[PDB]
Amino acid sequence: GGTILVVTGTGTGVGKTVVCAALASAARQAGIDVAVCKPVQTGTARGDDDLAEVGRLAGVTQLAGLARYPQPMAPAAAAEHAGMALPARDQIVRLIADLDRPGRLTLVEGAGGLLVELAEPGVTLRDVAVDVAAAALVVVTADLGTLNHTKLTLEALAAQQVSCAGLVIGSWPDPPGLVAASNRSALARIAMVRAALPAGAASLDAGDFAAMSAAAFDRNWVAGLV
Amino acid sequence: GGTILVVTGTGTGVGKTVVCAALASAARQAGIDVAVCKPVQTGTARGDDDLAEVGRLAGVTQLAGLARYPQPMAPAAAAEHAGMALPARDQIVRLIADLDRPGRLTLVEGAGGLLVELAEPGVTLRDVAVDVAAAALVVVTADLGTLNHTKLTLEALAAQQVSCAGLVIGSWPDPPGLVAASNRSALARIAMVRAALPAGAASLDAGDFAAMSAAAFDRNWVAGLVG
Numbered sequence A: 001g002g003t004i005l006v007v008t009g010t011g012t013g014v015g016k017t018v019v020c021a022a023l024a025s026a027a028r029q030a031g032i033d034v035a036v037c038k039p040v041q042t043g044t045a046r047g048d049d050d051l052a053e054v055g056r057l058a059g060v061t062q063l064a065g066l067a068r069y070p071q072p073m074a075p076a077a078a079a080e081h082a083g084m085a086l087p088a089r090d091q092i093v094r095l096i097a098d099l100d101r102p103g104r105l106t107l108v109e110g111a112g113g114l115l116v117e118l119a120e121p122g123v124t125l126r127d128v129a130v131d132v133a134a135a136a137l138v139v140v141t142a143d144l145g146t147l148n149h150t151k152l153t154l155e156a157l158a159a160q161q162v163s164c165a166g167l168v169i170g171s172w173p174d175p176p177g178l179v180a181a182s183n184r185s186a187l188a189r190i191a192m193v194r195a196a197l198p199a200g201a202a203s204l205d206a207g208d209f210a211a212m213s214a215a216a217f218d219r220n221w222v223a224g225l226v
Numbered sequence B: 001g002g003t004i005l006v007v008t009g010t011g012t013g014v015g016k017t018v019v020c021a022a023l024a025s026a027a028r029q030a031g032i033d034v035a036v037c038k039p040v041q042t043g044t045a046r047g048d049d050d051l052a053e054v055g056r057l058a059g060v061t062q063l064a065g066l067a068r069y070p071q072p073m074a075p076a077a078a079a080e081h082a083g084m085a086l087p088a089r090d091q092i093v094r095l096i097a098d099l100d101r102p103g104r105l106t107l108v109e110g111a112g113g114l115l116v117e118l119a120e121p122g123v124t125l126r127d128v129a130v131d132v133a134a135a136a137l138v139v140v141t142a143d144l145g146t147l148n149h150t151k152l153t154l155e156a157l158a159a160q161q162v163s164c165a166g167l168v169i170g171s172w173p174d175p176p177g178l179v180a181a182s183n184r185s186a187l188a189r190i191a192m193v194r195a196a197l198p199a200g201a202a203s204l205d206a207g208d209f210a211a212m213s214a215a216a217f218d219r220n221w222v223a224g225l226v227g
């Protein structure tokens, strides 16, 4: 196999998709083959489609999903409202394992935070990460409350022996502010801050996004991933 | 002693202060003596003062603070900004131990969520709860993300064998949309939902707040909290 990272977050709306896209873009520019798996996508009635954003921003073509629910809710609720079950644990684990190959970086994008139910019955991205022996990249904010949410998420990871690959600040404000700047330092005391993506990077075109992403991560860290 | 409950939350801004006041008011109307303490209060330069709001909303007079810092930030950062130190672990424990008394419900209001550092080094309200043998009441929202944050918080309580006294939904909208209604039902499968306080409760006057508080909790649960 190659390298599988689950990409999780401390909460909903932290910008996991732009982080997946930026790491994919950075890894591709280092000559690494990248695949991204989003097993479950909700919010499709209003056009939510995180895999398409990854394709547009980073140029990834190996983009795998299993299930799409119209309502903008947690997967289990969205599945309930549609009258259909979530995918089964075996579907997710084997899809990811079949994506994995030597020399490839495979990113698994969850929905919301680490412990939200993604598959039947009550299986989370954490469970998935155990099954495929993935490490976790944790997307965080720079806002008030991020320290508690980050610590909580890293404790949950450690409790099932899922390694933390580091943190990414999904949206770095401009200008920062006292809280954001304090939080960036405090976050780096609990884990490695791999990148802080500028606020608004999601709206960039592919060329600008590729330039941002190349600058955003440490080149040796990206290259060492695989 | 009596019964000590730490009142924590899944994040900042979930309404811990109103839940403290509501539970205090309900316990007082059942004849239970109540004290509330706030070991760390930040944002005092903004006028933040949770103890004084609990006193205003519930009439509680047995109010105990310890550390106060001006900037509206996490305690560690607020203390550093002021050139001050965080309290030591044993200082928070002494603040609480001095209030504990048979027949009294002592509420310990955290700052932000459960793993916020309240004392050097990296001492949290979870450690305090172990020290004083307290159970934890967890204030949650009904919003997107609450299920993950609630499960993360309960898992962290279990890791130190801190019992969970239940959840309180800090603000319950009227009417509830689909997300809020789904979350309430899912929260109730994670842990006992003790109350769900109507949104805007902090703007009720003394009498309305008292009535809301009495209606919001199961009288048997409240009465059962303290012998």
Ligand SMILES: Nc1ccn([C@H]2C[C@H](O)[C@@H](CNC(=O)CC[C@H](NC(=O)C[C@@H]3CCC[C@H]3C(=O)c3ccc(CC(=O)O)cc3)C(=O)O)O2)c(=O)n1
Pocket (backbone or CB within 6 Å): A143, A144, A145, A146, A147, A148, A149, B012, B013, B014, B015, B018, B042, B043, B048, B071, B072, B073, B074, B075, B111, B112, B113, B116, B170, B171, B172, B197, B198, B199, B200, B201, B202, B203
């Ligand atoms: N039923 C109901 C229910 C609710 N209400 C009303 C009551 C109220 O008016 C409001 C609910 N209350 C609010 O919103 C507080 C406003 C908010 N206050 C904070 O955030 C916490 C402090 C403020 C500055 C520092 C922060 C900190 O303590 C902190 C601690 C740890 C960390 C570490 C980490 O990073 O984790 C970071 C920060 C803000 O200032 O933004 O609704 C109602 O009426 N009826």
